[PDB]
């Protein structure tokens, strides 16, 4: 049997905020996959965002890119931030899955500008972010931003807020684009 190959190799990371592991060991590399079926095999055997502990993150990044703004592939980049204050457990999991499908399916013209995505699970407010390589590349940031709104089940209430990683680096957070 032959599986459906992906354009890129993707790595799943899990952050727990568990005191048992040292700060430098808290970001755990789970596994990598490069086929569609291997993605579903992973998806079907890992808990969805709505079932994971508070303070945890799931991050899906292209191979050899770590989920940290300070990584050389992310330093000059930024992120499209979706804040989910009043969201159901079903919509949260569906939004994370829709983001994952955009990524692995290479739904953007500026495919090479995608780095990964991160979902932060907090009781007070959940966030899904789509990280990009160059914060100053307006054409890519906007084409990605636009594709995200038209592929995701995102209404007028929840806004897409693009933030530079040089900005997150300091002290709310400064946004350079709103969609």
């Amino acid at each position: 049997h032959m599986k459906h190959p992906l354009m890129n190799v993707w790595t799943l990371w899990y952050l727990e905020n568990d005191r048992s592991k040292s700060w430098e060991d808290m970001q755990n590399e789970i596994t990598s996959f490069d086929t569609v079926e291997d993605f579903w095999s992973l998806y079907n055997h890992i808990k969805p965002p709505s079932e994971i502990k508070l303070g945890s993150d799931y991050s899906l990044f292209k191979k050899n890119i770590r989920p940290m703004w300070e990584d050389a592939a992310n330093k000059q980049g930024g992120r499209w931030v979706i804040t989910l204050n009043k969201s159901s457990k079903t919509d949260l999991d569906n939004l994370w899955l829709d983001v994952l499908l955009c990524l692995i399916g290479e739904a953007f013209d500026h495919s090479d500008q995608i780095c990964g995505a991160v979902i932060n699970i907090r009781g007070k407010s959940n966030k899904i972010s789509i990280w990009t390589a160059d914060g100053n590349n307006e054409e890519a940031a906007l084409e990605i931003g636009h594709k995200l709104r038209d592929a995701l089940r995102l209404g007028r209430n929840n806004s897409l807020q693009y933030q530079l990683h040089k900005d997150t680096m300091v002290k709310n957070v400064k946004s350079i684009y709103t969609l």
Partner: protein
């Protein structure tokens, strides 16, 4: 090499989309707290791509 959501959801129904990840043994030790659907005979909590695709089509 690209896939729209229709293609991606269809492939979720493949038997190969239900087998355990190749790194399952390593994953049991790396992050046991995130693992689910450990019994392959029980497909009750398996992701249904057909139902998910139909759900999208109703929102359209």
């Amino acid at each position: 090499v690209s896939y729209d959501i229709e293609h991606l959801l269809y492939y979720s129904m493949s038997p190969h989309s239900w087998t355990l990840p190749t790194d399952w043994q390593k994953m049991q030790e790396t992050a046991p707290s995130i693992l689910r659907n450990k019994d392959l005979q029980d497909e009750s909590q398996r992701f249904d791509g057909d139902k998910y695709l139909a759900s999208i089509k109703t929102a359209a």
